[PDB]
Structure formats: structure tokens, C-alpha cells
Design a protein around this ligand. Structure first.
Ligand SMILES: CC(C)(C)NC(=O)[C@@H](c1cccnc1)N(C(=O)c1cnc[nH]1)c1ccc(C(C)(C)C)cc1
Ligand SMILES: CC(C)(C)NC(=O)[C@@H](c1cccnc1)N(C(=O)c1cnc[nH]1)c1ccc(C(C)(C)C)cc1
Lengths: 305, 305
């Protein structure tokens, strides 16, 4: 019993983290086989941050301008190139601790574990979600750039996020591992507005199912609703519309609890319209939207890696 | 910016988890050097769960009655002994991934990371706290027994908790690595209820300081208070008393923000007497008490391991 914000074990990713220094700038790199991946803004200076010409900057750099360190070992950079907003440093040594991995670009509403690193050394691990506006509400200090987000399937690490920068409201922006930013953000110091955010409806329903599995049932009513009538209420409260795919995705949790998805929608419909009256659900006084249906099934069925 | 439930990197602990099998019972063990540690109730049967004679059960066992498995590697048992409520299996092979470690018995209010395991394989990592009533509010399913809690100092792993059993209200009870239970709980099927819990006051104050660091300052008022006038209010709301040591421990956070501790106590007093009025602090509508002052400093200053 119990329900916690649970991350994947971080061991496979720890052995890939290195430190990348260019000039006076230090951040983190991902060492996989003989390539180190890091944010290309490492080559930027204070005189360039407003609108850097990364092509011109990279041309000026040589291999010896990149200091890559893996613990005590300094890795020689033998080549450097740029793929979108990610710098790829070819090094002379393949990482012997390279796990099975793949690069994945995730969808809004999906979650992943972050290994927060500073100076190439891991600091902590936590779980977060790709918001509908393509930001992430992470915990990142100066120099956290190059920390990665990931999921673990079978025995294969799916890398889905590299951290680049903080946004005015304190949220964070980054890329996939091919260097394509999530959302409209760019790697320069400029006025960047994140779009209006919405609540991930299918994740709230999954978290409500997690509550029922753990005995928290007070919010259940005897009503049901149609998918169209629910979305008229979800619209008013800035909730993502619910699709039939979302309903089918909640199939496993509905079968485990014996509560039809449209029944749970009617309970959530009443929660949005009436509030929670100062009561709690799974030790929270707000509706949580950063657990996917798969997350709840993983934690309430106990899969291992 | 940002503030998350952040666990330590789990790689050092992952390389210590093994599977222990006695008869038809399987749970997790901790492999350090040539010794495997696991809960002693693995030698218990269904007809013994009400009141088992562990002395009788151990003396009749032989080394070949224990199956220890580290992934695919079968560890041959060359000795077995019992210390309090933990079984110690001496194996022929020392764990080549044994990290710098020590065994530590934590105090109520201190936090630790939990690596949840099933069949000797890690499933996920999360952050927990030792409640004042000596339970932990974890996420543990059947067979999670033997999963450990830990803290990491530089490169030394301080093991502080081993999971044993679940209590009626869905909270969890366990031991330190010497086999001594936290609280008055015993490893048998009997009527044992956790005592009424209280809130960790020094942790709430540190969490308020984390909020001020992240720009959440609406709860700061013009009042101050004395240590005694605050403790009179904290006792009324089932909060743990605030000691002078707690004030000194909050020294770094008070100096970072420039807010005196007694000033923050006056803000917390108003929050307890008037509620939060539906407002949030760091994304939560309740007062969080599972961040120690050290946890706040670690996340807001960025120490690594
Ligand atoms: C853009 C603002 C808000 C001023 N700062 C950040 O985002 C900041 C930071 C702070 C906290 C968390 N994440 C990142 N960040 C760094 O800490 C950093 C860059 N290199 C090493 N460290 C950063 C990232 C990118 C840049 C550009 C060169 C692209 C403009 C500059 C600084
Ligand atoms: C005591 C109750 C509440 C009925 N069950 C648990 O606590 C339960 C469990 C369930 C969920 C989380 N943690 C533990 N638990 C096990 O899943 C287990 C034991 N060995 C392998 N698995 C367990 C622990 C201890 C015992 C005895 C000491 C009585 C023998 C029996 C079962």
C-alpha cells in the first residue's frame, strides 16, 4: 500500500554522466559509446548570449577547447559537430558502462525520471512530466544543463530529455537527444513566453484510480456521464479534453477497481465543480496530474528493472 | 529554481540487492562484502505467522536451505546467524560492488531514500521520512521486504532502514541494519496499531524557507514571536516542539534568506491558526513536513555524490 512520486533506478544513467567545460563554462554531458552529448550553448559567452551565431562560434572552436572529464579521467575530444541544439563531442574512448539505450521524443502528458547533475556528478533523481505547454516543472540550479530525463523499459534506457535552460516563471526548457527543443523555445537569452498550460485530465483520472486502490474512496459518487458532457465541464476548468483513446488507456485501472471510466469522470466532474471541502486524496489537497496510467500500474503492480 | 521530492542516486545501492529464498518464501536481501542481510521472517511459514518461535526455526535450518541469487549468479551460503530481527547469510563471494557504507539508526523526523525491490531487482526510488510514531509512509507491495532506505554522504552510503511489514492503516514498519525495529512493532501477525502521529515542525519551517528561496513569500507577516509562545501554539496543533538545536540547524537557511527563525515561526503560527485560505506554497495546499533543513540546503545549493 501507499503511493509515492517514484522514479526509475538511476544506476544505468549515472555511469554515463560526465563534465564538459568550454572556457569558463562548465555543465554536464551524456557519454554513450564514443560520443558525449551536451547543450550547444556551452560554446556561448556573455557577449553572445543575446543572439549567438552558433555556426560561427563552432567554427572558431577546436577540439582542445572542450575539456571533458569522467571522474578523474580526462577524455580527449577528437571531433566536434552540432545536431540542432546539441553539441556532439567524439571522444577517443568508448564508455564501457554504456547501457542499452534509445533516443525517444515524448508527448505532452508523459512522465520521466530526471537525474539532476552538477559538474558531471549526480545530485538526485526525481519524477516529472512534460507539461501540455512543453515546459517541465523541474528542480534545476545553475550549471544543471546537460542533465537528462529518461524512462526504463525491459532493460533499455529511453532517453527523452536534455535540460538546457530556465524560463521566466521558474519552469524549464530542453530538447530531445537529437537536439530538437520541446515547444517554441530557443537557446538564447531573449523574452520567451511559455504558452498557457492545462491540466492533464487522463493523469488525474489515473491518480484517482490510485487513490481507490489505496482505500481513498470518499469522492466516488453513483453517477455516470458521457464523454461529451464531461469535456464541457473540463473546458471550463482548463482541463485537457478526454478522448476515447484516453478512456481505453485507463482500461487496466478500471478493471482492477471495478469502476467504469465514465463513472470516475462523473466523480472528477463533481470534484471540479464542488472543490474538495478541505479533504485530502492520497495525502494531497490538490488534484495531481503528473502520474500517467502506466505509472500507476507500475507502482500498484510492482514491475522491476 | 523549483523544488521536488528528490531522492539520492540509487546506483550504489542497486549493486547490493539480491534475492533470498527459504522454502517457498522469496524476498530481498542486502549483499555487502561476504554477508547478505535480510528480514528473519523469511524462515516463517503460514501456520507460524501468528506467533513464530524464531529460535526454533533457525537452529533447524542448514546452509543449503537458503537460496541466494544476485541476478543470475547463485551465491553459495557458508553460514547463517540471527541478530535481532535480521538474518545474516555468510556467502563464499564478497560483493565486488560493495560501496563505502555504514549502518546508522536515524531519529524521528530525518529523511532517507528508499529503493523498492521485488525478487532482488530494483523497481523504483523515492524519498521517505521516519515519522514521530516510528512508521514510514512508503510504497510497498507484497514481497517488498528487504528493501532498504539510505542516505549518501559524498561516496559513503549510510543504510538506515530495512522494510519488514505493513501496518493496518497502510503505513510500514521496519528495522535498522542491526535488526532493531523502529518503534514497538514486532515481526508477527498480531494486533499492533501505530500511535497517533505528529507533524515535524523543524521540517515545516525548512520547507517554508525553501518556498522563500523560490519566490513564494505571501505567508510572511509583520509579526514576530518568542520560542515559548510558538511552542504553546505548536503543541495545540499536534506539532513537535521546536528546540534551540532546531533553531541553530535552521541557521544556514535563515542566513541565505535574511529571515530570522522567530520571524518565520510567527508566519507559521498564523498559518496554523488561520489556515492557508485555499492558497498554495511550492505547489502544495498543505504544509509539507518531509524535508529536513539539510534536504532544503542540498536541493537549493546543489551538492553532488
Ligand atoms: C537563461 C537564464 C535564465 C539566464 N539562465 C539559465 O537558464 C541557467 C539555468 C539556471 C537554473 C537551471 N537551469 C538553467 N543557465 C545556466 O545555469 C548555465 C548555462 N551554462 C551553464 N550553466 C543558462 C542556460 C542557458 C543560457 C544561454 C546561454 C542559452 C542563454 C544561459 C544560462
Ligand atoms: C503482515 C501482513 C500485513 C499480513 N503482511 C505484510 O506485511 C506483507 C507486506 C505487504 C505489503 C508491503 N509490505 C509487506 N508481507 C509480505 O508481503 C511478505 C512477507 N514475506 C514476503 N512478502 C508480510 C510481512 C511479514 C509477515 C509476517 C512477519 C507475519 C510473517 C507476513 C507478510
Amino acid at each position: 500500500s501507499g503511493f509515492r512520486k517514484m522514479a526509475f533506478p538511476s544506476g544505468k544513467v549515472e555511469g554515463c554522466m560526465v563534465q564538459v567545460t568550454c572556457g569558463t563554462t562548465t555543465l554536464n554531458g551524456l557519454w554513450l559509446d564514443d560520443v558525449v552529448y551536451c547543450p550547444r550553448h556551452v560554446i556561448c559567452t556573455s557577449e553572445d548570449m543575446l543572439n549567438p551565431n552558433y555556426e560561427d562560434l563552432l567554427i572558431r572552436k577546436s577540439n582542445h577547447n572542450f575539456l571533458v572529464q569522467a571522474g578523474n579521467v580526462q577524455l580527449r575530444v577528437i571531433g566536434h559537430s552540432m545536431q540542432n541544439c546539441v553539441l556532439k563531442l567524439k571522444v577517443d574512448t568508448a564508455n564501457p558502462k554504456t547501457p542499452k539505450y534509445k533516443f525517444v521524443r515524448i508527448q505532452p502528458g508523459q512522465t520521466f525520471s530526471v537525474l539532476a547533475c552538477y559538474n558531471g556528478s549526480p545530485s538526485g533523481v526525481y519524477q516529472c512530466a512534460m507539461r501540455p505547454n512543453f515546459t517541465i516543472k523541474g528542480s534545476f540550479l545553475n550549471g544543471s544543463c546537460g542533465s537528462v530525463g529518461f524512462n526504463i523499459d525491459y532493460d533499455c534506457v529511453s532517453f527523452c530529455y536534455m535540460h538546457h535552460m530556465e524560463l521566466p516563471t521558474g519552469v524549464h526548457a530542453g530538447t530531445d537527444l537529437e537536439g530538437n527543443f520541446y515547444g517554441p523555445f530557443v537557446d538564447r537569452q531573449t523574452a520567451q513566453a511559455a504558452g498557457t498550460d492545462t491540466t492533464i485530465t487522463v493523469n488525474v483520472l489515473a491518480w484517482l484510480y490510485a487513490a481507490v486502490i489505496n482505500g481513498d474512496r470518499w469522492f466516488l459518487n453513483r453517477f455516470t456521464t458521457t464523454l461529451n458532457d464531461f469535456n464541457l465541464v473540463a473546458m471550463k476548468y482548463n482541463y485537457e479534453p478526454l478522448t476515447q483513446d484516453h478512456v481505453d488507456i485507463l482500461g487496466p485501472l478500471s478493471a482492477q477497481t471495478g469502476i467504469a471510466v465514465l463513472d470516475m469522470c462523473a466523480s472528477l466532474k463533481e470534484l471540479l465543480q464542488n472543490g474538495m471541502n478541505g479533504r485530502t486524496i492520497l495525502g494531497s489537497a490538490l488534484l495531481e496530474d503528473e502520474f500517467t496510467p502506466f505509472d500507476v500500474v507500475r507502482q500498484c503492480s510492482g514491475v522491476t528493472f
